[model samples]
Target: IKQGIREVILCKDQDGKIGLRLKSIDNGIFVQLVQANSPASLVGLRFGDQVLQINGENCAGWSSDKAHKVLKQAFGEKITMTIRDRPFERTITMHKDSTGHVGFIFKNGKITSIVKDSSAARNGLLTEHNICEINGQNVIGLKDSQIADILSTSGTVVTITIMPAFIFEHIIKRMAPSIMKSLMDHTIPEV
Candidate 1:
C-alpha cells in the first residue's frame, strides 16, 4: 500500500470530455468514478482519489457544485489536478533492460501503453504504472515530452520505479467477512 500526492492532467478528447465523476465532501472533492480506459483512469485516478487542487485553484472545502463547475469549464482544455491517493494502494517496481527500446508510452508521467514485445512488457510493466522516478530523477510534475527526454537521454539502459494502480484494500474489501476480520487482526494466530 502507498500514499502520496500525485499530479495528473485530464484533457478533453475528440468527444470533448474529461472522464471522471466527482463528489464533494467537507474536506475536498473525491473522485467517485473514473471511466474504464479513460484518460483519467489511464493516469492513475482511482475511485477514492481526493482532489486537492485543480488548475492551481484550491479545492479544499469547496462545494460539489462549485467543483463540478470548475471541471466542466475545462472541457476543452487541459485540467491539471493535484490529488492524494487513498491509503493501501499496491505498488510494484520494474526494471527495463538495455533493449534501447523499452516500449512504453507515457502521458502525464503515467504509463499508458506497453508494447507486447518490448522489454518493458517482458519485465512486467503494466499499463497503469505511475512513474515516480527515472534514472534517479524525480518526475512528479514533468510533462510527457520532458519525461521522454529523460528516458531518451538516460544512456542505453533505463531503470524505472513505478507504483501500480491496483488498490489493495479493494481486494480485501471484497473478501468474505470472516477473512476480513483475520486480515485486520493485530495479533498473529498460531500456525
Candidate 2:
C-alpha cells in the first residue's frame, strides 16, 4: 500500500502506559521506538516516524531532551501527534465467542489489546498480533469492517492467523547482547 501522512492520538490509559520513544532530528523529532501493544503503535505509529507536533505545539527544531521533557510534561493528558511514515504489518489469531465480540481493540488493521476476561484473552489472543486470515479466508487487504463481518458471520468459534509483534527483537536479544545493540538499535539516520 502507498504510504500516507497520518495523525495519531495517544492517551495514557489506552495502553495503560506511556509507549513512545523520541529522538531529536535536524528538522523535527523522530520516533525511535514504539512499544508493541501500546497506544502509540495502536495508532499505526512506528520507528522512524517523524513527530511534527505534540498536542497543539509545533515541535520542529526541538532537541531530543526538549522533546523528552515536553512529552513528560504532557503525561496523563491526551496527546496528539502529526507524523509521517509508512505503516508496518504483523499478524495474530483470535477466536470470537458467541457474543460476536472478540473482546479486543483493533487499529491499523492489527489487534492492539485484549479486554480482561474476554474470550479472546481466554483463548490466548495477544496484543500486537496482526490478523492475516479468518476462517480459512485471506484477509490481507481487508478493512476493520470487513474483518468484523467475517468474525460476526462465522460460527461461535473461528480461526485466525496473526503475525506476532517484536518476536525478532525478543529472540535476538536473548541470543546476543553485543549484536543486538549494533544491529537492532534503531538509530535515526543522519540527514
Candidate 3:
C-alpha cells in the first residue's frame, strides 16, 4: 500500500513510560525501538517509522531528545500520531481495539490476513508487510509463548511497527527454521 498521510492513534503511558524510544537525525524523527506487550507494541508503530507530528506539533523538526521529552510530558493524553511508513519513514503506529485485536494477522513473520475494520485496516499497514523487532524481550528466538506474551501482556493498545520484505534483516545463512516450523507447525493456533 502507498504510505500516504495516514494517521494512527495511540494511548501512550499515563506516567510517561511510553515503552518506546526515538531518534532524531537529519530532520527525521525515527522510532528507535519498542517494548513488546506495550501500548506501543500493540499499535502499528515500528522501528524506523517516521513521526510526522505528535499532538499537532511538527515533531520531525524536534531533536530526538526534544521529542522524547514532549511525549513523556504528554502522559496519557491519548497521544495521536501522523505517521508515514518506515523509510525512509522509519517508525509507525496503530492500535488494538477493546477485543484486543488488530485487523492484521501474520504467520512466520509475514502478513497473513487482515480482519475487517481492525486497526491495521485503517492504519498504513498492508498485506505482506514483515514483522521485525518483535520486541519487549527481543523476538529473535521468538517461540509460540513469546507471541502469546505479545497478545496476552498487551492491554487494549500497543504500537504496531512494520516494514516491507526488503527492509527485513534476518540471521543470514539459515533462511532459518521458523518457516519449516511454522508453515505446517500444525502446532500453531492455540487461541
Candidate 4:
C-alpha cells in the first residue's frame, strides 16, 4: 500500500539509527527529529534533543568518568530512546526524570480495521484513529507487526490512538485479543 504524503513513519535499522551528541553539559543527552534524508536524518533526528538513557541505562546526570565505559556498552546495541520534543506550538510540557521511561512509539498514519477481540477493537479506536502513538513514544514508519510485537509483552497494556483508515489488517495479525491473552497468561517460570 501507498504510505502517502502527510504520513510520517518511524523506523529503526541495526546500523543506520541516529545517536545524539549532547548539546550542552547541563543538558541531558538530547535526541531530536530531523527530516528523512541525511545519514542521521533517516531516523528523524533533529536539533535541541536529549538522549536520556542508552540501551536501558540512565543518561540523567551521566558523568564524564562514566561516559566512555557506559557509552561503549550502549553503542551498536539495539537501544530504546526516549526523546522529549516541545516546540512553542504545543502547550504540553514534557519533563524527564531518571526513573521515567516509555515503551511505545507514535507515527502519523491511518488505522484500517476492527479485529474481533483486539485492544483497538475493544477501545473502539475505529478504522481511522490516525495511529499517533504505539505505547507512549512516537512511531515513525513501523509495520503493524513491529508495533504489535512491542505492545504484546506480558503485564503490559498498550495505549494506541488510531486515526481512521478504510482497512486495518495490521491490527488483526498483531493486536488481536487472543494474542494479547496468550502473552499475559502463558508463562514459563524458572524450574
Candidate 5:
C-alpha cells in the first residue's frame, strides 16, 4: 500500500461540475483548485495533491491537455482519481533586483528557470517550484496571464509560498510523517 496515495471517487453535481481544476506543473498534475463547499472539497482533495491515476489508467507524464480530455470522457460518470499527497510547502522572502525581477523565468506562477547568481538562486527558489501564495494571498487557480500583473505590484521583498515537484522517494524519506502530525494540531473547537 502506498502511504500517501488516496483514491477519491468524485461524482458530478447537478450542474455537471466536479468543482475541481487540474493543472500540469513540471512533471505532475496537481489539484490546483477546489471550489468552495463543492464535491471535490467535500472529499478533502486539497490544493497541490498530485494526480497519479484516473480510472485505473496510470497518468505519469500526462499533459494538462491530455488529462482534460480524459476527464471529460470521465464525466462518463464517476471519476475514480488516484492521487498522492504532495505534502511539501515552503515560504521564502525574496527581494527583487534592480530590474524589478525575482530572477526566475516562469510561465504563469510556475517557475522553470534557475539562473546563476540571481535573486532566485540566492533565495533558494528552484525549477519546478510553483508560487501558490504571494504575501499570504492565494494565487492558486488564477489565470496564467494574470500572474504577471499580480507580481508586478507585489513590491520588492515578497513573501511567496511555494511547493516543489514531488519526488516520491525523497518525500518518503523526509518529514512526511511530520506533516500528518501537523495535521493533528488543528483544533476542533466548534465541535
Candidate 6:
C-alpha cells in the first residue's frame, strides 16, 4: 500500500480475465496487481523489460523517471509486447550465482525500478502495481533483463496493459508533473 501512483480504469479481457491499466511506463517501474480484497502485489520487473519494444518504442536513453510518466500516460492503450524469459544459460546449475539473477524487480505482477531516473519514484512509482502486458505481448513472467534489452534499444512508442493503484484506502494521490515541485522532483529535472 504505497503512495504517489495513480490507477487507471479496470477492464476484462476476451478470455474474461481481469486486467489493469498503467499510465505509460514513465510514471513508475513497479506494476501492481489486484486480486479482490487483497493488497497490491509485485511481479519482480527489471530494467531490461523497459528497454524492449512494446508497440515500437525503445526504452533506452529515456530517463527511468520519464518512462514512469509514459507508463502512467499509456492507460487503456494497446501495444505489442516482446518479452524475454530467464536466459537459457541460467540452466547451468553448477555455475548458479546470485549475480545472474534477472535484472527486473516486481511485487505482484508489476516491474521494479533500478535507477533513480527509472519508472519507480516516490511521487513517481511506489509499489503494488500490476502490468497486464507490453505492446501486444501479454505473456506472463517476462524476465527483467529481457525487458531492459527492449527498452534500451527500441525507439517506437509501445502500448502496455497496466493496473495502477486501486484500493480505496491506498489510492494514489500524486499530482501531475505540472503541479509537483520541480526543484526536488527528479522525475522532470531541468537540463
Write the residue-wise lDDT of candidate 5 on 1-191 in tens digits: 12578899888778777766666666677765556556676566655678888888987788777887887777546888888864456678878888788777776467888787877789888777766667655565456565666678888887777776453223223223443233211111221
Q: Write the per-residue lDDT of candidate 3 for residues 52-164, one digit (tens) a residue.
A: 88887887578767988888777465888887765641333567677667666677566667888777777757766655543222333355456656755765655544556
Rank ordering of all candidates by lDDT, starting from the highest: 5, 1, 2, 3, 4, 6
- Candidate 1 segments whose C-alpha is farther than 4 A from its true place: 87-191
Question: What TM-score would every model get versus the actual structure?
Answer: 0.45, 0.43, 0.47, 0.29, 0.48, 0.25
Q: Sort all candidates by TM-score, best to worst.
A: 5, 3, 1, 2, 4, 6
In terms of lDDT, the best-performing candidate is: 5
Error of 3 at 77 (Å): 3.2
Tens digits of lDDT, candidate 1, 60-160: 88876788788778745678999887532334344445555678888756688888777777777777666655654435444578678777776666777
Off by over 4 Å in 4: 1-19, 24-27, 31-39, 64-69, 75-77, 86-191
Candidate 4 contains a number of clashing pairs equal to 41
The all-Cα superposition gives candidate 6 an RMSD in Å to the true structure of 18.2
Q: What is the lDDT of residue 40 in candidate 3?
A: 69
Task: State the lDDT at 72 in candidate 3.
Answer: 74
**All candidates' lDDT scores?**
0.62, 0.60, 0.58, 0.38, 0.66, 0.32
Give the CA lDDT, 0 to 100, for residue 174 in model 2.
26
Candidate 6 C-alpha lDDT tens digits along 1-191: 12122222223334433322222233322222222211111222211122243345654455545644554555323434333331110110111123332233554355455234332331233344444444433323334454444444433443344444353112223423232222111111112
Ten-residue stretch with the least lDDT total in model 5:
182-191
Candidate 5: give the clashing pairs. Answer: none
Give the Å error, residue 158, model 6: 37
The per-prediction tally of clashing pairs is 0, 7, 28, 41, 0, 86
Give the clash total for candidate 6: 86
Q: Write the per-residue lDDT of candidate 4 for residues 62-119, one digit (tens) a residue.
A: 6544644554454443445554442101111222223332222334345454445444
